[PDB]
Design an enzyme around this catalytic site. Sequence first.
Site, PDB file in Angstrom:
ATOM      1  N   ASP A  43      34.338  51.339  50.435  1.00 53.73           N
ATOM      2  CA  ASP A  43      34.203  49.858  50.989  1.00 53.73           C
ATOM      3  C   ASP A  43      32.996  49.397  50.355  1.00 53.73           C
ATOM      4  O   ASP A  43      31.946  49.937  49.914  1.00 53.73           O
ATOM      5  CB  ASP A  43      34.179  49.685  52.342  1.00 53.73           C
ATOM      6  N   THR A  76      36.076  42.032  48.759  1.00 54.47           N
ATOM      7  CA  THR A  76      34.809  41.298  48.504  1.00 54.47           C
ATOM      8  C   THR A  76      34.024  41.739  47.403  1.00 54.47           C
ATOM      9  O   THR A  76      33.253  41.164  46.849  1.00 54.47           O
ATOM     10  CB  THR A  76      34.048  41.524  49.924  1.00 54.47           C
ATOM     11  N   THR A  77      34.128  43.097  46.908  1.00 52.18           N
ATOM     12  CA  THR A  77      33.539  43.865  45.966  1.00 52.18           C
ATOM     13  C   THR A  77      33.837  42.923  44.510  1.00 52.18           C
ATOM     14  O   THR A  77      33.294  42.785  43.702  1.00 52.18           O
ATOM     15  CB  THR A  77      33.829  44.940  45.680  1.00 52.18           C
ATOM     16  N   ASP A 369      44.846  48.213  58.263  1.00 51.51           N
ATOM     17  CA  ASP A 369      44.680  47.374  57.355  1.00 51.51           C
ATOM     18  C   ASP A 369      45.894  46.633  56.716  1.00 51.51           C
ATOM     19  O   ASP A 369      45.736  45.553  56.091  1.00 51.51           O
ATOM     20  CB  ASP A 369      43.819  48.070  56.320  1.00 51.51           C
TER      21      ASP A 369
END
Length: 505
Positions: A43, A76-77, A369
């Site tokens: 993550d 988000t990365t 998720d």
Amino acid sequence: RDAQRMNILAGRIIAETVRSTLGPKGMDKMLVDDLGDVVVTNDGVTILREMSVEHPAAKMLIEVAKTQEKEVGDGTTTAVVVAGELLRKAEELLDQNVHPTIVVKGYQAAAQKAQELLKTIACEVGAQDKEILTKIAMTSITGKGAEKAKEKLAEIIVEAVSAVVDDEGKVDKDLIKIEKKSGASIDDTELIKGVLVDKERVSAQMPKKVTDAKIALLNCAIEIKETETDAEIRITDPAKLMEFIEQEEKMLKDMVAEIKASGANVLFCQKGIDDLAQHYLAKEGIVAARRVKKSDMEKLAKATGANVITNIKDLSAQDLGDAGLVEERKISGDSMIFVEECKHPKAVTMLIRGTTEHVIEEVARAVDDAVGVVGCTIEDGRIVSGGGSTEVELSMKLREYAEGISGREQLAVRAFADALEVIPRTLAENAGLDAIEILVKVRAAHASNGNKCAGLNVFTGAVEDMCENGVVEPLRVKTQAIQSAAESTEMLLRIDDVIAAEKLR
């Protein structure tokens, strides 16, 4: 002299360490601190926590990610790796007698222009579209790790999101919950109606197998209540132990009898009950419980048609509850019921089943998720074809539209297009393929009348269909990244109120 030249090189270091860690398959680095605990996490925000920073010019690259991480909490990365690319390109033009004001002006124009071009390419998805809804299941389950039986798991999990749809067509993530217990296979789970209880017993004694039993949902306890006025209790007679035990039975026999005489049969108490009081419930055949979670009375309000009443002594016929289909089933030992609500969405508990404590927990790390990436698509009701498709599609259009923009700002709009095609590049290097000769073939499909549903597959290594294969991500996961990236990267160029050597405060 320039000073800022020492900060532009910092974004590449923090971005390079998390550059090859993209996509499902990818190595995970580790920053062993002074303690010694070696941990690894793919993550984005996780690895950023336990880590020390040197120069204070890196507190504005992660802050922008916290805003998007709290919303979608996924991808988000991708917003950080794209900033490092367009940053290096700025250095190639800065030395060409170009002022930073001309570079920051191009990103704002290209970012706003991309919105009009994205909505046109963004596909449409309906909350009731059962045919299209099933296509989202294979897109989420395959983006984690479950190819052993994705064809079967994707068919049973879609039934939940398909049935827990509201009238307006939206859906929230809080309405879904997952658990883990022993069993045979995940197929044992069944969807019918009702909400499952969280807490369980503490001592085995009460009956645990009574098919068809009226449930009573109340909050109270049977103990010596004290008056509001300040008072105490005094005792000075050791010969007074086997007396109240018999007198107290009269107060409990007739009182508890009202529960069965009224109509109810099962009751979830709020506090522990005496041991002797439980032995009578076994011989008489009455079922009861205790220590029930507080987040279960409101869920069972309409899921079964019961009523939430405070005191339990006055449990008349009107204060009776209701239950759906209490079908007791031996769960590899302890017989329980797995009622699952769907008709009226409130709090479904699609528990996990399996004959291994280590396997039932592994599935929880993924199914939790899946509801997020699949639930968000039903809210806004819009999705954009991902997998490097929307990247190469817009790049070919900005070059033609940039011809009309006359001025010195035409250098940034062109260089920015090369920073959007970095998504398929990182995926190609992970597989061990040349990321130069393959890019010329990707543009062949999306040349003129190229279908927007096409893209690129990392497994087979050739252009394939996205909707058919299941490579379509939401629109907010990519628009917010480019929108937030153009607003955060420009902060480094802007300077006026820096924290120069002027006291800490």
